[PDB]
Amino acid sequence: QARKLVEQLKMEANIDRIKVSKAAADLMAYCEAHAKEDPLLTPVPASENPFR
Amino acid sequence: VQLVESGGGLVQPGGSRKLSCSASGFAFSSFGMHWVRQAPEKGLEWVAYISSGSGTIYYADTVKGRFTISRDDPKNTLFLQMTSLRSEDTAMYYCVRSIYYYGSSPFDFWGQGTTLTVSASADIVMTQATSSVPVTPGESVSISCRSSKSLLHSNGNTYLYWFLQRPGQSPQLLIYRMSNLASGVPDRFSGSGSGTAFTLTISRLEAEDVGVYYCMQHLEYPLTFGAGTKLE
Amino acid sequence: ELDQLRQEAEQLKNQIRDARKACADATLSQITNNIDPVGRIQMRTRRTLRGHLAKIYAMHWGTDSRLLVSASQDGKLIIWDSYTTNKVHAIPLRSSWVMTCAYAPSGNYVACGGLDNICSIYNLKTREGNVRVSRELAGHTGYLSCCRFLDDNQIVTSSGDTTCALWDIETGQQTTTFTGHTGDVMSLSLAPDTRLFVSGACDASAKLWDVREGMCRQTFTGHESDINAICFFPNGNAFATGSDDATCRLFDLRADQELMTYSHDNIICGITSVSFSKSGRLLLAGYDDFNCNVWDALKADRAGVLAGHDNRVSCLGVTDDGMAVATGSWDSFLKIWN
Amino acid sequence: TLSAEDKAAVERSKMIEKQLQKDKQVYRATHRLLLLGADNSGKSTIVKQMRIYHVVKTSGIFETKFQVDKVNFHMFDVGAQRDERRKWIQCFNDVTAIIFVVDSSDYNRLQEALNDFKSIWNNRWLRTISVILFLNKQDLLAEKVLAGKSKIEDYFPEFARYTTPEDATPEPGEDPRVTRAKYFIRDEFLRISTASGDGRHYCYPHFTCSVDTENARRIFNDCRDIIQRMHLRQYELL
Amino acid sequence: VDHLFPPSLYIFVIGVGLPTNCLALWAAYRQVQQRNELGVYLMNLSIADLLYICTLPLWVDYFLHHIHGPGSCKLFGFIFYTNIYISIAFLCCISVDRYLAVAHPLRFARLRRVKTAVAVSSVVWATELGANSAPLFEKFPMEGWVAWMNLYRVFVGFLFPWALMLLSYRGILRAVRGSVSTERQEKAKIKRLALSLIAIVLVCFAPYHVLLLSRSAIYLGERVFSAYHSSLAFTSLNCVADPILYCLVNEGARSDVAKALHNL
Numbered sequence A: 001q002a003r004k005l006v007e008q009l010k011m012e013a014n015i016d017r018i019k020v021s022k023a024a025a026d027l028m029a030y031c032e033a034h035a036k037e038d039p040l041l042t043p044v045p046a047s048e049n050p051f052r
Numbered sequence B: 001v002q003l004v005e006s007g008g009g010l011v012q013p014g015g016s017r018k019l020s021c022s023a024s025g026f027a028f029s030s031f032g033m034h035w036v037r038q039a040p041e042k043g044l045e046w047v048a049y050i051s052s053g054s055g056t057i058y059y060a061d062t063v064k065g066r067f068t069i070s071r072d073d074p075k076n077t078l079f080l081q082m083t084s085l086r087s088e089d090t091a092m093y094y095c096v097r098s099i100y101y102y103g104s105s106p107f108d109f110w111g112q113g114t115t116l117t118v119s120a121s122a123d124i125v126m127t128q129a130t131s132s133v134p135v136t137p138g139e140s141v142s143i144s145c146r147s148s149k150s151l152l153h154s155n156g157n158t159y160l161y162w163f164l165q166r167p168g169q170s171p172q173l174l175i176y177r178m179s180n181l182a183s184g185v186p187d188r189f190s191g192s193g194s195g196t197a198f199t200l201t202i203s204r205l206e207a208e209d210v211g212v213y214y215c216m217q218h219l220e221y222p223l224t225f226g227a228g229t230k231l232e
Numbered sequence C: 001e002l003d004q005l006r007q008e009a010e011q012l013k014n015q016i017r018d019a020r021k022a023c024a025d026a027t028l029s030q031i032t033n034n035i036d037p038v039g040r041i042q043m044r045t046r047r048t049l050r051g052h053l054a055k056i057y058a059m060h061w062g063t064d065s066r067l068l069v070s071a072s073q074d075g076k077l078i079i080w081d082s083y084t085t086n087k088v089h090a091i092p093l094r095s096s097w098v099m100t101c102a103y104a105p106s107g108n109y110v111a112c113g114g115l116d117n118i119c120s121i122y123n124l125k126t127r128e129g130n131v132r133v134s135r136e137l138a139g140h141t142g143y144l145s146c147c148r149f150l151d152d153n154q155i156v157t158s159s160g161d162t163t164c165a166l167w168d169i170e171t172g173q174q175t176t177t178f179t180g181h182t183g184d185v186m187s188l189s190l191a192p193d194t195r196l197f198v199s200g201a202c203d204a205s206a207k208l209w210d211v212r213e214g215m216c217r218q219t220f221t222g223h224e225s226d227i228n229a230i231c232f233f234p235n236g237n238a239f240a241t242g243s244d245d246a247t248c249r250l251f252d253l254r255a256d257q258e259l260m261t262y263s264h265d266n267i268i269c270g271i272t273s274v275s276f277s278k279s280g281r282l283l284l285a286g287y288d289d290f291n292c293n294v295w296d297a298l299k300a301d302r303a304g305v306l307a308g309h310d311n312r313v314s315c316l317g318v319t320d321d322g323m324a325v326a327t328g329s330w331d332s333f334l335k336i337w338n
Numbered sequence D: 001t002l003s004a005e006d007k008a009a010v011e012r013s014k015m016i017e018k019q020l021q022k023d024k025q026v027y028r029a030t031h032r033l034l035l036l037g038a039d040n041s042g043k044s045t046i047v048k049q050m051r052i053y054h055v056v057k058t059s060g061i062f063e064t065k066f067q068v069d070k071v072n073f074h075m076f077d078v079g080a081q082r083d084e085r086r087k088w089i090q091c092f093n094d095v096t097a098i099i100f101v102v103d104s105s106d107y108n109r110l111q112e113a114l115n116d117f118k119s120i121w122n123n124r125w126l127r128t129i130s131v132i133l134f135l136n137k138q139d140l141l142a143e144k145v146l147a148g149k150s151k152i153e154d155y156f157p158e159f160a161r162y163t164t165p166e167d168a169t170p171e172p173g174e175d176p177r178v179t180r181a182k183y184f185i186r187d188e189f190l191r192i193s194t195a196s197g198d199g200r201h202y203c204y205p206h207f208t209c210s211v212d213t214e215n216a217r218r219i220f221n222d223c224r225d226i227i228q229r230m231h232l233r234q235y236e237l238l
Numbered sequence E: 001v002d003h004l005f006p007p008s009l010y011i012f013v014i015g016v017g018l019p020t021n022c023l024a025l026w027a028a029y030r031q032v033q034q035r036n037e038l039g040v041y042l043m044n045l046s047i048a049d050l051l052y053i054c055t056l057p058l059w060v061d062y063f064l065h066h067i068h069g070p071g072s073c074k075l076f077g078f079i080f081y082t083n084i085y086i087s088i089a090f091l092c093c094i095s096v097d098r099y100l101a102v103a104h105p106l107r108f109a110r111l112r113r114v115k116t117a118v119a120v121s122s123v124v125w126a127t128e129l130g131a132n133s134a135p136l137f138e139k140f141p142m143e144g145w146v147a148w149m150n151l152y153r154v155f156v157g158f159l160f161p162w163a164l165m166l167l168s169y170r171g172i173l174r175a176v177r178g179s180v181s182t183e184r185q186e187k188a189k190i191k192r193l194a195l196s197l198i199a200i201v202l203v204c205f206a207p208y209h210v211l212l213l214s215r216s217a218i219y220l221g222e223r224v225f226s227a228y229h230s231s232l233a234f235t236s237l238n239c240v241a242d243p244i245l246y247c248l249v250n251e252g253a254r255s256d257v258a259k260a261l262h263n264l
Helices: A004-011 A020-033 C002-023 C028-032 D010-027 D043-053 D088-092 D110-121 D138-147 D174-193 D213-232 E006-033 E038-054 E058-062 E070-081 E087-105 E113-132 E150-155 E161-179 E182-217 E222-233 E238-247 E252-263
Strands: B002-006 B016-024 B034-038 B044-050 B057-059 B065-072 B077-083 B091-098 B114-118 B126-128 B141-146 B158-167 B174-178 B191-195 B198-203 B211-215 B229-231 C045-049 C054-063 C067-072 C076-081 C086-092 C099-105 C109-114 C119-123 C131-135 C144-149 C154-159 C164-170 C174-179 C185-188 C197-200 C206-211 C216-220 C227-232 C238-243 C247-252 C257-262 C270-277 C280-287 C294-295 C304-305 C313-318 C326-330 C334-337 D030-037 D063-067 D071-078 D095-105 D131-134 D203-206
Touching: A004 C002, A004 C216, A020 C028, A020 C247, A020 C257, B016 B091, B044 B065, B044 B077, B057 B065, B057 D203, B091 D088, B126 B211, B141 B211, B158 B191, C002 E222, C028 C257, C054 C326, C067 C099, C067 C238, C067 D213, C076 C109, C086 D010, C099 C144, C109 C144, C119 C154, C144 C185, C154 C185, C197 C227, C238 C270, C270 C313, C280 C313, C334 E150, C334 E182, D030 D043, D043 D063, D043 D071, D043 D131, D043 D213, D063 D213, D071 D213, D095 D110, D110 D131, D110 D174, D131 D174, D131 D213, D138 D174, D174 D203, D213 E087, E006 E058, E006 E222, E006 E238, E006 E252, E038 E058, E038 E070, E038 E087, E038 E113, E038 E238, E058 E070, E087 E113, E087 E161, E087 E182, E087 E238, E150 E161, E150 E182, E161 E182, E182 E222
Parallel strands: C054 C099, C054 C313, C185 C227, C227 C270, D030 D071, D030 D095, D095 D131, D131 D203
Antiparallel strands: B002 B016, B016 B077, B034 B044, B034 B091, B044 B057, B065 B077, B091 B114, B126 B141, B141 B198, B158 B174, B158 B211, B191 B198, B211 B229, C045 C334, C054 C067, C067 C076, C076 C086, C099 C109, C109 C119, C119 C131, C144 C154, C154 C164, C164 C174, C185 C197, C197 C206, C206 C216, C227 C238, C238 C247, C247 C257, C270 C280, C280 C294, C294 C304, C313 C326, C326 C334, D063 D071
């Protein structure tokens, strides 16, 4: 049964990893881009939310 | 699903009758029921309405005291008791089911109908265009409709309905709430409106598309239908 | 040899750890400390959904952002209309021990399961006016913890035995079997592109699988106890998990590492549900101490607190348009916040 | 105010609420129990006898209903579950009582049963939940003790210094040795139970066989002094 | 003595009742919010005590003078002379509810709901108001409307509910005696509490009723005016002892009150 684990670990290890700072920058960019389309972030005026 | 009804015949003036609608093939107890009558050469008119649980009962302004409606779930049938039959009650009466929840499609199924022969306020009025419109296989139609009062509500729903009656059996539902296509109808049919003016469009006519097209409003009781237009 | 295989596996794990350490040069907090904090967030309850008899374990939103489904230990599924607090359906179940539910993206089917080891699929749009069972799926040995819909004919389930499976609905036979876990699986989340999914298990590990090929891609081991919740970032390149060690964590697939940990010295109880916001700026987490917190997903500080329940919070969900959140607890009450 | 189609969605919701209230009335009058024990212990015979006297390939739960003195009882056991228990035991934090059946004629697997009893008694989610423990297979214990083929002192050294308590009441009347052995086993379990009771829940011991017909009565009595205690706590009396 | 002992007694009663009988209302509300039917009875009892305390200031003025409108006099007299029986009826209801809960568990679940509790509360309110409405529709003369209504209000307003509560608490004690989970100290505490409730009720409400019967007996077959006036002051410590015993001896109600005070 150890052969399957060894093969799975070998398959997992052969991948390409980007820098962590690039991932952080991408998450920040996604957060900044969709800033106006988030009612929880910016409280929508009490004339458009259906839960008034 | 099916709906078989019986109890019609010739009645002298001043008599009484009891119409019955036998239901089989679906959950009767969770549905509301209506009676709709049609004159031999005229349009449809609403008669009465019973609710699931028999909580709300409505009648038309013409038969408010004469007619009585009732149901019994265990026997799975529906009754309508009529008294003091005049000469203006000669029509073919129908049995239609309707359910009501968010996203439901009322008036989905219609029964066969029963015949009946008798020997001799500020309600919304809906206006139809000229009855006829000559057509050919292969082209489009632009049936129109009009209303006295706007049918748009604060919820955002426009309560307009469309029905098609073939030269044979009972009418079938086509469009409900002015934008939705019923189950089983092809994609050729489409509907649109603007609150007081409405239209129905058929993209490519076929041989089975002939008949008479009717309208309805469901904003408030009583429900008015309209004259209807014929495609030949 | 078994010893040789174990030594090779240990060496390969050491190599993977060395690669992960080498690929890290900066922390998320260091990059994000030059960004204005969101500030205090005031979310207020708008409606209360009553009618359940016992504690609530599961809840899912509809695509239309107006309908709801909830599961309770009394053996019922209730479909709510959030705008008007009306009840549309009430489905009684054969087994009273249900701890999962899901709404299909089309809105025509729902699913449920639990200690009976069966995933049941219900049909909502029939010629008759009732709701009836469409198919019961069998083949799992242990209890079922989660289930999600890919389309109208494919479903994914996670069970008590260390196994996740992909099913066909027209024919009840399985299509693929996902193996590799050691303990019970308790969480499941699909990607936005419906090509990959993640699962959290009791062995303090998380894995990512591919639906077509049917093999494990990457593994993540950062926690110290069981993982009870999992969710996807809207981008599709990150996921966040909650555990019983009173900590939340955020991972990333491209870097294959951990970015931030959301913890406080006052909180001792473990988390039970994790859900993101539409933009990913806020992370909402439920806790065992009868309260649900709100975190800033970029700076790792407590933005706000929701406290309206008298018992532990079991489920939490955010709608598609991001206009509201829903919270269910063991007090048999559902609350919509805004 | 509201449109016609929408004052017909309220009526449907009200009907659903009426059905829910009826279901609640039915729900509040049923007491739920969880049956738990090892595979060696004869809980299957107990449940078969209960099903016979009173009232599907890899299914994970089984349900049995029985009624005594016009009150309803539901019993559940787990068939297809794995060895782990700490996860699905959370769903049983509102049951009336937990029935723990343990074999008493083994002398070899008794320590495992005692460890399982401590795991159950000290669970975080299983607090304020009472436990009724059944010491099954008394006939085998009596026969084995009378025969003398195998001893008990070897497995438990402290048996030599143990003496029969003065509160022992042997109803039928039998040999002192079997009474001493079974009371020693009960005392071990009771010491484990009352080590850290803290007064929030109790443990009810019983000696029984699988074919006995009086198990339902014992369960009924225990559930009555558990409901009585909870009502004492709730109604501001203690 | 009407200008010395009453005013002093009523001053303390007014000073202490208003704070005490107000947190009791909130505790009862917290109890009913958790689907407990004892909260309904506690709420109604607290409401009756609060109303009787509110109608007291006017009688303090007469205590200062040993004459402001016959309608107002009747309005402030009837709801002062008919607030001794509503509390007694609600105490009897609480005792019967506890007996049903403890002595007969696994039975009579239909009588242990909020709906039946509020129905019984409305029924008892209506009966108390209607039955004692005869004055609506205390002088030197006797032998008249006070000749048998003074003998009925002692045997139906005092002796019946007191006997009912005595029987209920004795049954509760007998049922508790046979339990195996409860220890001896808890049983002693329960016995002390039950005896305390019965004793305080009897001590507060007996002297006035025995004096009434003694006075009314001679009318069909001075000292009475001296002693009688004072006993009307003694039958007021109930509005102070009742909230204490039913909302402050326990721990849950005290914790709820403390949490409410902290939140407010």
